[PDB]
Amino acid sequence: KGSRFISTLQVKLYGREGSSARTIKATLPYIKQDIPIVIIFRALGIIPDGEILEHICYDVNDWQMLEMLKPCVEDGFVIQDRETALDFIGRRGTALGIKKEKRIQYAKDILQKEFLPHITQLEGFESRKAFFLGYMINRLLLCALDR
Amino acid sequence: SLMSCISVGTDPMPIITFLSEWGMEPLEDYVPHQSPDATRVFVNGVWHG
Amino acid sequence: DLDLERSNRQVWLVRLPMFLAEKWRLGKIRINKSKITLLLNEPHEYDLELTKKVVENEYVFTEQTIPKKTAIVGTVCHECQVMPYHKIVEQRRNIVKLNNKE
Amino acid sequence: TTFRFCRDCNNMLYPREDKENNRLLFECRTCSYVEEAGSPLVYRHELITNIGETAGVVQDIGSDPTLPRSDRECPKCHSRENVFFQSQQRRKDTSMVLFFVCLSCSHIFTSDQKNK
Amino acid sequence: FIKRDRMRRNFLRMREYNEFPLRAIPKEDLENMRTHLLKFQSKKKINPVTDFHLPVRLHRKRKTRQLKVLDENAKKLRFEEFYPWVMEDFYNTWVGSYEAGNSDSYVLLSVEDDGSFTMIPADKVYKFTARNKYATXXXXXXXXXXXX
Amino acid sequence: DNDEKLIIRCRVVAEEDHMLKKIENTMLENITLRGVENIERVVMMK
Amino acid sequence: DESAPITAEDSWAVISAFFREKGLVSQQLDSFNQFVDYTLQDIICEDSTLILEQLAQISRKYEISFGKIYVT
Ligand SMILES: [Zn+2]
Numbered sequence: 001k002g003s004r005f006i007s008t009l010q011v012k013l014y015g016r017e018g019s020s021a022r023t024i025k026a027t028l029p030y031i032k033q034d035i036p037i038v039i040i041f042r043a044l045g046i047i048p049d050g051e052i053l054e055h056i057c058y059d060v061n062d063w064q065m066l067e068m069l070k071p072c073v074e075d076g077f078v079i080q081d082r083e084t085a086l087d088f089i090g091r092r093g094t095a096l097g098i099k100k101e102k103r104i105q106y107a108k109d110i111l112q113k114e115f116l117p118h119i120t121q122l123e124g125f126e127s128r129k130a131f132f133l134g135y136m137i138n139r140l141l142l143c144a145l146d147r
Numbered sequence: 148s149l150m151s152c153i154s155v156g157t158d159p160m161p162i163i164t165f166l167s168e169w170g171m172e173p174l175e176d177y178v179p180h181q182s183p184d185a186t187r188v189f190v191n192g193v194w195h196g
Numbered sequence: 197d198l199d200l201e202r203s204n205r206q207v208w209l210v211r212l213p214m215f216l217a218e219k220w221r222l223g224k225i226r227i228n229k230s231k232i233t234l235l236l237n238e239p240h241e242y243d244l245e246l247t248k249k250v251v252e253n254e255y256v257f258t259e260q261t262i263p264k265k266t267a268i269v270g271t272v273c274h275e276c277q278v279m280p281y282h283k284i285v286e287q288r289r290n291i292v293k294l295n296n297k298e
Numbered sequence: 299t300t301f302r303f304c305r306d307c308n309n310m311l312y313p314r315e316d317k318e319n320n321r322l323l324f325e326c327r328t329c330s331y332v333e334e335a336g337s338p339l340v341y342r343h344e345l346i347t348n349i350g351e352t353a354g355v356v357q358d359i360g361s362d363p364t365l366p367r368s369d370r371e372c373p374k375c376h377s378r379e380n381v382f383f384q385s386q387q388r389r390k391d392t393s394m395v396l397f398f399v400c401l402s403c404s405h406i407f408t409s410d411q412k413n414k
Numbered sequence: 415f416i417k418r419d420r421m422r423r424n425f426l427r428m429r430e431y432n433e434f435p436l437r438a439i440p441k442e443d444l445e446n447m448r449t450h451l452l453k454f455q456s457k458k459k460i461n462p463v464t465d466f467h468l469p470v471r472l473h474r475k476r477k478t479r480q481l482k483v484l485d486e487n488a489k490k491l492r493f494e495e496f497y498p499w500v501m502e503d504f505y506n507t508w509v510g511s512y513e514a515g516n517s518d519s520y521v522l523l524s525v526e527d528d529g530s531f532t533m534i535p536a537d538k539v540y541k542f543t544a545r546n547k548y549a550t551x552x553x554x555x556x557x558x559x560x561x562x
Numbered sequence: 563d564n565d566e567k568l569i570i571r572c573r574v575v576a577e578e579d580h581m582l583k584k585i586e587n588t589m590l591e592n593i594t595l596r597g598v599e600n601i602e603r604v605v606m607m608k
Numbered sequence: 609d610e611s612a613p614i615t616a617e618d619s620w621a622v623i624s625a626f627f628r629e630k631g632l633v634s635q636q637l638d639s640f641n642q643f644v645d646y647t648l649q650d651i652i653c654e655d656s657t658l659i660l661e662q663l664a665q666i667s668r669k670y671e672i673s674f675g676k677i678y679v680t
């Protein structure tokens with residue numbers, strides 16, 4: 001109820017079938033270019049990659065999904081810090097902040113408010129949204145495996 | 148069709164409040180390695196636990 | 197001037213039901229050797245489950261760049277959860293589903 | 299394929315060739331944690347995928363009313379009460395071989411008479 | 415084979431144990447100190463504060479007539495305290511964050527020397543993360559290195 | 563052909579794995595064993 | 609008896625007890641009535657507060673808020 005939100009989140013899977021290096025990049029509102037999912041996971045407070053693969057894929061026995069996660073773990077290796085991820089999303093989209101100290105906190109406020117308007121919009125719900133995001137990635141890759 | 152009606156919408160808060168009284172673990176406490184066979188609960192698309 | 201007092205203190209964390217928790221906002225715990233209960237004051241007795249046996253990397257501190265007075269309490273010893281005349285509590289739980297507006 | 303993670307770092311262990319002793323190793327490029335290799339295998343593509351046909355099998359699969367019922371006996375417990383369903387792997391070239399799921403020992407025995 | 419419309423006439427013609435007491439600490443100590451929780455995110459099982467060594471330090475790091483929007487209380491008090499704390503020595507680093515959702519109902523049963531226990535209501539709860547294990551970074555160097 | 567398991571192995575003169583993986587793509591896609599391009603499913607009809 | 613299974617024709621009675629309660633066009637009446645009952649108070653209460661900020665040189669403010677709406 002209220003405001004009538006129109007913002008829509010999109011998680012895109014690049015690379016056709018057969019070719020290698022099939023990375024995953026999800027778009028964010030108010031941010032121009034697309035951002036990889038792992039970098040967003042770094043911006044949500046989750047730094048290690050084993051926890052990321054633990055949130056995306058819920059079955060350790062399956063090797064296919066984890067195998068397709070590898071390139072995203074490589075680009076997620078390029079950017080390894082949460083602060084560098086907040087500065088990365090701060091430098092990627094929305095250039096009206098000018099100052100960096102206000103664009104990192106402004107980007108964090110974007111991740112706490114505009115990012116996923118449903119559930120809630122308060123501060124501290126980043127773990128929950130991380131689990132939901134890993135669920136959406138699990139549905140995307142699970143749909144890519146022809147299952 | 149002659150017996151088809153349109154819903155009007157209720158309140159999901161009493162249901163979410165009623166679920167946590169029977170051991171519904173919140174989402175932020177979830178570990179897939181400690182509870183792999185746990186059934187996910189969804190209320191209007193929101194994953195509460 | 198942060199100082200660790202002891203940390204040797206062992207604390208148990210409890211996830212209480214809402215009416216008794218808001219009431220606490222005294223009883224006697226009966227430890228039965230792997231099943232423990234609670235005899236409140238007149239009133240119910242409550243079995244408390246050993247929710248998490250091993251509970252490391254979890255501690256408790258208190259508070260008395262801007263540095264403030266910080267004190268350390270104790271280590272968390274066991275994760276617990278209180279479990280529950282139950283028909284009156286079930287009726288109260290059915291009764292909470294009757295909220296309306298004017 | 300079934301790779302390990304680093305300690306403390308929890309990052310994936312990229313393969314490192316050991317030219318001194320001439321043996322495979324597993325490294326973490328963030329830190330200095332390198333463990334030995336218990337297998338020379340590294341990568342397996344597996345083009346023709348046959349797994350996933352029997353996906354989504356749960357302990358409570360016998361209480362599904364939408365699923366059918368058959369009278370064929372199990373080769374193990376010899377129970378004629380079972381629930382059958384085809385492959386879960388959805389693809390064009392997926393065969394229609396039935397999958398029998400006994401309601402006693404929870405064994406999954408198929409109906410293929412050519413290959414078992 | 416016909417519609418029976420005479421149902422009005424048909425219906426009209428047819429019808430060993432160990433007991434230990436609990437106590438509530440006086441509210442003076444609750445007014446002096448606020449109890450918060452600690453949870454680490456380094457996977458390592460042990461990690462006590464004694465092995466964290468010393469000295470342990472946990473510290474928090476012209477226009478005419480116009481329009482304002484509005485805001486409430488508790489959310490504003492939680493919004494103004496946007497400086498997370500950190501514990502270090504003089505090296506290991508732990509930076510905590512708020513948990514919020516794990517407030518609800520959390521009662522502490524601190525065990526003293528005797529068998530009795532002391533119950534304290536939990537104010538908040540924080541998740542501490544071991545920071546700067548590897549020690550590396552770059553900013554613009556990574557922004558130019560990611561363009562290859 | 564006599565082998566009940568058909569096996570093919572290949573080697574070359576950073577890590578060698580990435581090089582091999584490139585060659586894998588070239589092998590699968592860019593090699594045509596026989597037949598002219600853009601011809602599939604030739605059906606015999608009387 | 610009273611615990612006997614029903615037949616096919618008997619079902620018609622049920623359908624009657626349906627249309628006696630709802631009516632042929634009950635969805636518009638229920639949706640409109642719920643709109644008048646709850647939607648008005650929700651829209652009025654969700655964004656009623658507006659404040660004017662007045663400056664003088666001592667600061668000053670003004671506020672207007674809407675409460676319970678009334679229908680005739
Ligand atoms: Zn490492």
Ligand SMILES: [Zn+2]
Binds near residue numbers: 375376401404
């Ligand atoms: Zn069987």
